[PDB]
């Protein structure tokens, strides 16, 4: 879902667009997330906070299936007790600012399941290599 258009398509440009349309511009927010006598200390701790946050997010990705995919799929199924709404009414109706609030309570339940499924898939892969 990308077409020909000459406008800049910049950082947080599609924050209000629906989340089926902001997904076609995710490398922009990924790009503009890292590079940007006493005050050098303040600037320096701001820069190390930036690189620490980037490393924490890349570590959360890396212990899951995707390390540099930027769109990755996994093997845990969507529990319908979490959001109880249709597939058609998320990708064409709501935004990420509005979808963030609706699963913020069910966040950190999902991440443990992601790590659990990735550890189980790693040990299944190790056993499948080991039986050969």
């Amino acid at each position: 879902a990308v077409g020909i258009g000459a406008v800049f398509l910049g950082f947080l440009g599609a924050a209000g667009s629906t989340m089926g349309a902001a997904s076609m511009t995710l490398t922009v927010q990924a790009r503009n997330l890292l590079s940007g006598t006493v005050w050098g200390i303040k600037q320096l701790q701001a820069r190390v906070l930036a690189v620490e946050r980037y490393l924490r997010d890349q570590q959360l990705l890396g212990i899951w299936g995707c390390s540099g995919k930027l769109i990755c799929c996994t093997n845990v199924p969507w529990n319908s007790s979490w959001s109880n709404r249709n597939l058609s009414e998320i990708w064409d109706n709501m935004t990420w600012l509005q979808w963030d609030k609706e699963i913020s309570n069910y966040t950190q339940i999902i991440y443990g399941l992601l790590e659990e499924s990735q550890n189980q898939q790693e040990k299944n892969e190790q056993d499948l290599l080991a039986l050969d």
Binding site: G10, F11, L12, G13, A14, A15, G16, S17, M19, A22, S23, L26, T27, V28, Q29, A30, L33, L34, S35, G36, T37, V38, W39, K42, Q43, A46, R47, L49, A50, Y54, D57, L60, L61, W64, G65, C66, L70, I71, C72, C73, T74, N75, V76, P77, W78, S80, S83, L87, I90, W91, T95, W96, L97, W99, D100, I103, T107, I110, L114, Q121
Partner: protein
């Protein structure tokens, strides 16, 4: 197919509200000046004027300038940066001394008072053996009589050694751009009728703020940001009387301010590499410093602000304006800095109005202090050196900081006093638009695809 599979996405545009430390920046022409002739010229990064912004469609965030951060940060940083331009400067330890003060050579009128005292004193020379006798001119507000003979002293001889403001560094305002680090963004509200509280329907992200010239003015905030089409009054809660009302109007009011006295800066050698810049002669007439506003445009802007104040107080309300109820010097009379010179100008001619619900120029007199107690610290005053020549400057009255009196017992009217108070009301009138948010990637959402093993 009704079973969905979860997918985590990186780079997701979504933010939370956050509190971070923004960093200073200056324009490239502001970065062009050097050697600390102004404050911290190489400490801040250079950037463009009017930094780049993009518009965000179909988005609505609630703002609040009153619980906002980064006015606290700007207040703390401007106080500390004011302090850090004083450590190379000269302490007036040897000048706390007995001042033998007589009147200035002038036709003395016994009803009025001379506002200048000609004070002679012993000054230590560059040699630690010999001392000299030297005279200077001080104001009444800077010396007090200690208890025939008439000997004075400075008012700050019992609290601090008073650091001289260095005549190399200037106190002119240069615009600061507050830039966000990586991972954070800054949102600006482009809405017209937005009172700084509640949902803004038209925001835009921007990397740095627009230019904020640091002005220090208690009443009548100068060189500010003009409103778009009408006068906008802004308060945290109108019915609370201990909250200031920030009035920002459309077309600015031109004010002229002057000291017409031609002064002579005279150097006095305190010690090795220690120079005190005193007043020498008053070349010519002894005249009083003052300011002018236009009578007609001030009546026009008062009519505009009464027209806008009647929206929150009913139509049949009599709005009257009276002067300040009392306090210190720089909370009752409006202070500013006209090029290294601190004026205290009387506003009783301005707020003298009543308003019913049916070529001239106001002269307003000023006082001048040489030693100041900015931000009311415990042990840090500041001598300010005299400057040569007649001093005139032109400025724009941008807004007002009003305060309603405690109206009770069937108040048919509601009256409004000017008042400076905290400096943050001066700083909240420029960062009312912006806020700072934390951009958080790694959203998570269901879609109909399982990972192929």
């Amino acid at each position: 197919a009704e079973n969905l599979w979860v997918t985590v996405y990186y780079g997701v545009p979504v933010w939370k509200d956050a509190e971070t430390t923004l960093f200073c920046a200056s324009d490239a022409k502001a970065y062009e000046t050097e050697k600390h002739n102004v404050w911290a010229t190489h400490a801040c990064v250079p950037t463009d004027p009017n930094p780049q912004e993009i518009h965000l469609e179909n988005v609505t965030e609630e703002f609040n300038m009153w619980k906002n951060n980064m006015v606290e940060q700007m207040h703390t940083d401007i106080i500390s940066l004011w302090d850090q331009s004083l450590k190379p400067c000269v302490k007036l330890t040897p000048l706390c001394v007995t001042l033998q003060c007589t009147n200035v050579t002038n036709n003395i009128t016994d009803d009025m008072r001379g506002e200048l005292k000609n004070c002679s004193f012993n000054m230590t020379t560059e040699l630690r053996d010999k001392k000299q006798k030297v005279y200077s001119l001080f104001y009444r507000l800077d010396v007090v009589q200690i208890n025939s003979n008439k000997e004075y002293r400075l008012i700050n001889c019992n609290t601090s050694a008073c650091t001289q403001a260095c005549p190399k560094v200037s106190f002119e305002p240069i615009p600061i751009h507050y830039c966000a680090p990586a991972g954070f963004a800054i949102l600006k509200c482009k809405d017209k009728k937005f009172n700084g509280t509640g949902p803004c329907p038209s925001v835009s992200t921007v990397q740095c703020t627009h230019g904020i010239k640091p002005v220090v003015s208690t009443q009548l905030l100068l060189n500010g940001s003009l409103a778009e089409e009408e006068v906008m009054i802004r308060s945290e809660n109108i019915t609370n009387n201990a909250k200031n009302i920030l009035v920002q109007f459309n077309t600015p009011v031109q004010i002229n301010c002057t000291r017409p006295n031609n002064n002579t800066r005279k150097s006095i050698r305190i010690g090795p590499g220690q120079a005190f810049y005193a007043t020498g002669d008053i070349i010519g007439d002894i005249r009083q410093a003052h300011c002018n506003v236009s009578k007609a445009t001030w009546n026009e802007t008062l009519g505009k602000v009464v027209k806008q104040l009647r929206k929150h107080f009913g139509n049949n309300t009599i709005i009257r304006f009276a002067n300040s109820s009392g306090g210190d010097l720089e909370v009752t009379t409006h202070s500013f800095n006209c090029g290294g010179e601190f004026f205290y100008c009387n506003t009783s001619g301005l707020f003298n109005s009543t308003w019913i619900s049916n070529n001239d120029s106001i002269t307003l007199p000023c006082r001048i202090k040489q030693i100041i107690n900015m931000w009311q610290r415990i042990g840090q005053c500041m001598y300010a050196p005299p400057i040569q020549g007649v001093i005139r400057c032109v400025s724009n009255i941008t807004g007002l900081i009003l305060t309603r009196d405690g109206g009770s017992t069937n108040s048919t009217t509601e009256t409004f006093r000017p008042g400076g108070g905290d400096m943050r009301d001066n700083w909240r009138s420029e960062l009312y638009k912006y806020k700072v948010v934390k951009i958080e990637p790694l959203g998570v959402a269901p879609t109909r695809c399982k990972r192929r093993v």
